[PDB]
Paper text:
We used 12-mer peptides, P6-P6’ (with the scissile bond between P1 and P1'), in our co-crystal structures. Six of the nine complexes were solved with the dimer in the asymmetric unit (in P21 or P212121), with both active sites in the homodimer occupied with the substrate, while the other three had a monomer in the asymmetric unit (in C21). We observed that the substrate peptide was extended along the Mpro active site with the scissile bond (P1 glutamine to P1’ residue) positioned between the catalytic dyad in all cocrystal structures. The N-terminal (or non-prime) side of the substrate had an antiparallel beta-strand conformation which was conserved in all structures, with the substrate residues and side chains well resolved. The binding mode of the C-terminal residues (prime side) was more varied, especially beyond P3’ position, and lacked full electron density. In addition to the fully conserved P1 glutamine, which is stabilized through multiple molecular interactions, the large hydrophobic residue at P2 was extended deep into the S2 binding pocket in all structures. The sidechain of the conserved P1 glutamine was also extensively coordinated in another hydrogen bonding network. The volume from P4 to P2’ is highly conserved between all of the substrate complexes, despite the variation in amino acid sequences; this high conservation reflects the specificity and likely evolutionarily-constrained regions of the enzyme.
Residue numbers in the entry:
A (entry chain B), D (entry chain B): 205 to 212
B (entry chain A), C (entry chain A): 1 to 305
Write the structure that this text describes.
């Protein structure tokens, strides 16, 4: 699992 | 009467939300006076985010690489810099809708309103707490980074949170408005995990006082307890220790209801040890811990802005 | 990820809120174009409210008896009339902040955002459902009448609720913006009681789909059920009957998750018959019924305004 | 018990 940076 | 998870009115913040695009990466920014604040990972590409060197990535950009849109108006970027994990984009026009504001950093246990946004446009508003492990249990999708958390006092918006990222457990991590992360997290797509969380005891007590103010009294009892004997029960149930400062902060609610804080602690002990036996408190079958004592007084007394 | 009770951004409504005083009675009004809408019991005195004759009470007033304040600006009343249980106060200036808007009446089971206000000033925002018994479980204190409930679609505010009063059980009753009460209530301080309430089944199913979308899957099972066998269980547990139209409305969430609606009904049957055995769904130990299928899609897909 | 009209 990894973190998700939430720009788009 | 009634008790709801209640957010601050969001109009003052809505007027500050903009869209920031760099390349194919779009997110939200906060436009105050002539600066736009946004998460620095707007400068990343898909391949950049495992271990970006943000200093390198930023040196390779200039002002014209940042497209900022306030509604249907494009804002010209005339300066850019990095401050910890946020970018400051200086623009050539000051936001005429800038409210009176402060940048404050909050403590675990404190609450705030979140204005969730996509492409610079507000989507919805909800209330959050800073967890003891410095995560927040938000509702955020791809594109929500740059959405801010805030409190309002009188006419002044105190910004305390800017959203960056989602951990694998589905909880969220972000920075204060100076770009400094809450908790031991970094803006990279790596394996990171929150520390173990705990329940915010003073808040549970505040919510029990709200329940009494609203006529839910079934959990009350004639018992009292000592602060030391209570804290032994809190440790066993993964609750934060209660301090004398917490007892003091709860003073006003204690006086309003006539139930002493250590008397209410006796109720909480019994709820922890036996559950609710199929009953509910303020519509909940769980002990709620995202209302502060301030939130309770604010809502049960009708403070406005 | 994440799922929160999320309200619409309130700025468009904040710009419409005013204060209306008649005598010593103050409450909120809604200023759209050159009309201010407010609950007609602003014209009551303390002795008037057991059985007011509102027609009589209004004939005895003139325009100058209504003091309307928009912020620090007093608005001159140039006309007044009664429409069912609201007053229409015509003022001499149109609200420059009037949004695109509609007056809509909602059905039980539908949700909306409430902007709670005191003395014309917003205090907080939260999400509500119209209960099957036409009450709402709000958070309202003395002075909150005239606060409105609303939904936003694109740029258009659909007003659906204006707050009037609190029933003895602590729940709330009000009108649409044409002044017509939701449910069998009247704006008098008499003994009135809500009819028995029930749980909004289609909403519970929608929230179970939200839970699956967010990774809560423990309540799923391999069983299916028939719509008739399900509705026999719903009747026993005080749930509203599920219709084929409900099954159809849940279609999109069913397709997104791959769980057939009648398969999810089998889960709900088991939760009703056995409880959760100490587990939680989306942070709740109770079956939540104030999210519509639209609310779920909206929040899990990031619709903005 | 009675209803309470919530003007102020």
């Amino acid at each position: 699992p990894h973190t998700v940076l939430q720009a788009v | 009467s009634g008790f709801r998870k209640m957010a601050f009115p969001s109009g003052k913040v809505e007027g500050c939300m903009v869209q920031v695009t760099c390349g194919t990466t779009t997110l939200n920014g906060l436009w105050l006076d002539d600066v736009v604040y946004c998460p620095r990972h707007v400068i990343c590409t898909s391949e950049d985010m495992l271990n970006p060197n943000y200093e390198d990535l930023l040196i390779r950009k200039s002002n014209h690489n940042f497209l900022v849109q306030a509604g249907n108006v494009q804002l010209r970027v005339i300066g850019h810099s990095m401050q910890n994990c946020v970018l400051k984009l200086k623009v050539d026009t000051a936001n005429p809708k800038t409210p009176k504001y402060k940048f404050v950093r909050i403590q675990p246990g404190q609450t705030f309103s979140v204005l969730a946004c996509y492409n610079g446009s507000p989507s919805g508003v909800y209330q959050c707490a800073m967890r003891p492990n410095f995560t927040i249990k938000g509702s955020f999708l791809n594109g929500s980074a740059g959405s801010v958390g805030f409190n309002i006092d009188y006419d002044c918006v105190s910004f305390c949170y800017m959203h960056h990222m989602e951990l694998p457990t589905g909880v969220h991590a972000g920075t204060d408005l100076e770009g400094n992360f809450y908790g031991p997290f970094v803006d990279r797509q790596t394996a990171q995990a929150a520390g173990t969380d705990t329940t915010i005891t003073v808040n549970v007590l505040a919510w029990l006082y709200a329940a009494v103010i609203n006529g839910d009294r079934w959990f009350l009892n004639r018992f009292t307890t000592t602060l030391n004997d209570f804290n032994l029960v809190a440790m066993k149930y993964n609750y934060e220790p209660l301090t004398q400062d917490h007892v003091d902060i709860l003073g006003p609610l204690s006086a309003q209801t006539g139930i002493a804080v250590l008397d209410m602690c006796a109720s909480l002990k019994e709820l922890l040890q036996n559950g609710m036996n199929g009953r509910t408190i303020l519509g909940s079958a769980l002990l709620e811990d995202e209302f502060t004592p301030f939130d309770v007084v604010r809502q049960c007394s009708g403070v406005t802005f």
